[PDB]
Amino acid sequence: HSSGLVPRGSHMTYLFSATVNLGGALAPIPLLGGGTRVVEPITGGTIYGPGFNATIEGGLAAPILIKENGTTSQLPWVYAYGHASDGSPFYIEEDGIGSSATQNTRLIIQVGGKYADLQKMYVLGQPSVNEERTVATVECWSHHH
Template identity: 70%
Template structure:
């Protein structure tokens, strides 16, 4: 995190610097058939069957969860995906955790935010703004997620 100097009485500009926290590897099960939505688009429901999380800020085993993105088609043939992901498991110290991930993106790349509920030695994650970048393999059987803490102005 840095604050840029300003001149002539202007407020300082806060420029956050993301810090790498962890990477997750998530196994996806067979999705349900797409569910059409009245407002347009489709919801895709995919079970999370397990996975791992590792990095300097968090180590855990994902035991289950659910991905339920909404896919919207635009008039020009492109698709926008609203991500809604929920997972749970146990941290390396035995503490249970639950996370919610949501965001938006198009194609294979997305930007999301993770809200973490966890205790034990990883309890500080509950106070962090966690930015994530999920990617799903072509077969839609494995997702990888890179996660970063983003400091907020004090």
């Protein structure tokens, strides 16, 4: 308990993990400047945790791979949709650009219903992928704006 009406101090709060099934990737597309766009359709998946539970029904991952100063970066653009456990439709977008001297990128979650308050949060996601490129995983927490 603090004096005043707003508690201060860092509070990062775990929200959920997303398991994303990938199916049918396209061959890399060569971009002006030397990068590549890799299109990976999403065939399904699930989201589970204290802050969000949902079934993924579709979308796509569209990472860009770009070599700069010898190192290859991935801009992990993802667009996905489905229904939350209360039946509410949702749309999720993972930003490819994660500037904040941090590796993670912002996930924006747009959903009504029981999980609507996710729209008010600043959500950061950590994506990873298995070597068969069949399943991607994202782990998401809220941060202070």
